[PDB]
């Protein structure tokens, strides 16, 4: 084949991401939020899911752990504008950063993690969990880097047994994304590459 899902999945997930804390809501109106960041940067953020639809009103403070949907641009006024998709949460913090319990398998064998980050927010968006999990997978464990590893899944299970799963052979379904979760309530995260 040519027209490959992959190299597209790899460039999205191997890429960095934007993290802002204590951003302020300038607006929330037509399925999108307008947001002021604390580095003199602005963000227009879309939310295509009927199940995840931020209710934050102008003036409220938000946290951003988000990905860019296209190139950011400068303006004048003279400020950087970003175009992002989801990953807007409340600013509620954990007293201590925690490591989220991720276990990876590659070739049916436990794959030791590396640079798996700690989190200090109570809430993360499921899309955020997703690009963090997949970044760990793309950068340390070879996901999308050899035909060997192009599928598999991740599965998060809460304390109360409800689950979130995403297939790594596909892009994250932003259009049907569920609301953020209390990450301190995550029981395990399992990823398997096949």
């Amino acid at each position: 084949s040519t027209n490959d899902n992959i190299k597209d999945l790899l460039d999205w997930y191997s890429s960095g991401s934007d993290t802002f804390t204590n951003s302020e809501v300038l607006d929330n109106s037509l399925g999108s939020m307008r947001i002021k960041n604390t580095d003199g940067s602005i963000s227009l953020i879309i939310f295509p899911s009927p199940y995840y639809s931020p209710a934050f009103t102008k003036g409220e403070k938000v946290d951003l752990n988000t990905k860019r949907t296209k190139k950011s641009q400068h303006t004048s006024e003279g400020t950087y504008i970003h175009f992002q998709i989801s990953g807007v949460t409340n600013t509620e913090k954990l007293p201590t950063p925690i490591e989220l319990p991720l276990k990876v398998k590659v070739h049916g064998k436990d794959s030791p993690l590396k640079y798996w980050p700690k989190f200090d927010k109570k809430q993360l968006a499921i899309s955020t969990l997703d690009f963090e999990i997949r970044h760990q997978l793309t950068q340390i464990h070879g996901l999308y880097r050899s035909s060997d590893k192009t599928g598999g899944y991740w599965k998060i299970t809460m304390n109360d047994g409800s689950t979130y799963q995403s297939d790594l052979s596909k892009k994250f379904e932003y259009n049907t994304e569920k609301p953020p979760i209390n990450i301190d309530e995550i029981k395990t995260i399992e990823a398997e590459i096949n």
């Binding site: 191997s14 890429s15 960095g16 641009q73 590396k114 980050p117 950068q139």
Partner: protein, 118 residues
């Protein structure tokens, strides 16, 4: 024709700290700044390519959280290695290219920066 500096030239820091390394260019375009790392006894390897307006795209083994790249303007890419551990000690080098090329384009290197983590 694009003198790219790095700042600082060398820095010695303590474990667990975070360390900002700069990549500057005077003129005037530049769509892409590249970050490279060289460990002792080893090749000068690519760790990220940064297209301006996008988040940097990372090579195998390099994670966004441990090596944060900020490329707001075409003057300034900054690499920040967070939670510095002794095994991060090495030589860090940026480079810059403009239009058009790809691919057989011309790549201009910074003078590099020595990071030592104690």
């Amino acid at each position: 024709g694009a003198v790219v500096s790095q700042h600082p030239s060398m820095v010695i820091v303590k474990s667990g700290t975070s360390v900002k390394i700069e990549c500057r260019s005077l003129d005037t375009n530049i769509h892409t700044m590249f970050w490279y790392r060289q460990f002792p006894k080893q090749s000068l390897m690519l760790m990220a390519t940064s297209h301006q307006g996008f988040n940097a795209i990372y090579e195998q083994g390099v994670v966004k959280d441990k090596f944060l790249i900020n490329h707001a303007s075409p003057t300034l890419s900054t690499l920040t290695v967070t939670s510095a551990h002794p095994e991060d000690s090495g030589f860090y080098v940026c480079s810059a290219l403009a239009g058009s090329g790809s691919s057989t384009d011309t790549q201009y290197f910074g003078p590099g920066t020595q990071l030592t983590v104690l």
